């Protein structure tokens, strides 16, 4: 009632305060999901998150707050597969338990992207990845797992076929196994690049001039580059690797720094 009025007011106020398009999108989505649900508990959650976004001035914390509220509202609105609820719960538990902001943002972003897809194949891969992260006490390994899960989930929401997600699942499992055995962060970032290249149905060449590997990626539509960049840049930040990304016409070059 009064919460419904305030939710719509706050979402508009948040859109005036912050110029970043993602906050504006998440604020609008929170209002929409809060209305689509008839749960008071979802309404108090959306209200609390939007209000904190207005009280705070740090865009980064506000982004994370809205990501949590939209995730929870998306899986609590109506009746969703049990796997979506379990994905959201385990991501929210990983975020609440960690002090590293990279784990909070990796968990929320991987879980919200999975919550947007309807493929049961994609949900079980993301859930199995979050189960492994929860079993570990190694925050370094958790960041590797979340980087893989977010890359995979982005392929799913970018429309990758079930067949390409089955191949991407194999790389998710390969990356986690390699990280558990002590593979370098550079090796793990290369695996994310390979995942995105195969998942988007394009091609790559790998060149190792000296100490630093260079991947040349061909065949991406320009508006598909953003998906690969988000997956690779995010994975590189999560695993502590610098990458240099250069663009030509249809060609993307990524240097993995060592």
């Amino acid at each position: 009632g009064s919460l419904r009025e305030e939710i719509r007011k706050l979402a508009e106020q948040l859109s005036e305060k912050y110029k970043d398009e993602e906050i504006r999108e998440l604020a609008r989505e929170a209002a929409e999901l809060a209305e689509e649900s008839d749960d008071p508990e979802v309404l108090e959650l959306a209200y609390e998150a939007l209000k904190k976004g207005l009280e705070l001035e740090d865009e980064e914390k506000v982004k994370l707050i809205l990501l949590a509220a939209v995730l929870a509202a998306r899986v609590a609105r109506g009746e969703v597969p049990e796997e979506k609820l379990e994905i959201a719960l385990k991501a929210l538990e990983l975020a609440e338990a960690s002090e590293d902001e990279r784990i909070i943002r990796g968990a929320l972003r991987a879980a919200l992207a999975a919550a947007r897809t309807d493929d049961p194949l994609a949900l079980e891969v993301v859930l199995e990845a979050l189960e492994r992260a929860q079993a570990s006490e190694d925050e370094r390994l958790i960041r590797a797992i979340l980087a893989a899960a977010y890359a995979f989930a982005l392929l799913a929401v970018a429309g990758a076929s079930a067949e390409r997600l089955k191949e991407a699942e194999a790389i998710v499992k390969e990356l986690i196994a390699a990280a558990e055995k002590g593979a370098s962060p550079q090796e793990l970032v290369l695996l994310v690049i390979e995942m995105m290249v195969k998942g988007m149905g394009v091609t790559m060449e790998t060149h190792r001039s000296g100490n630093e590997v260079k991947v040349v990626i061909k065949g991406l539509h320009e508006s598909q580059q953003e998906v690969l960049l988000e997956a690779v840049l995010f994975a590189a930040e999560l695993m502590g690797v610098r990458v240099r990304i250069r663009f030509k016409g249809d060609t993307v070059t990524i240097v993995v720094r060592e």
Binding site: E44, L45, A69, A76
Partner: peptide
């Protein structure tokens, strides 16, 4: 499902308070 949804909402509220 109802029990999981309540736990998701409860954990999300705790996280938002922590982030704030």
């Amino acid at each position: 499902k109802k029990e999981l949804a309540k736990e998701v909402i409860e954990t999300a509220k705790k996280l938002i308070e922590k982030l704030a």
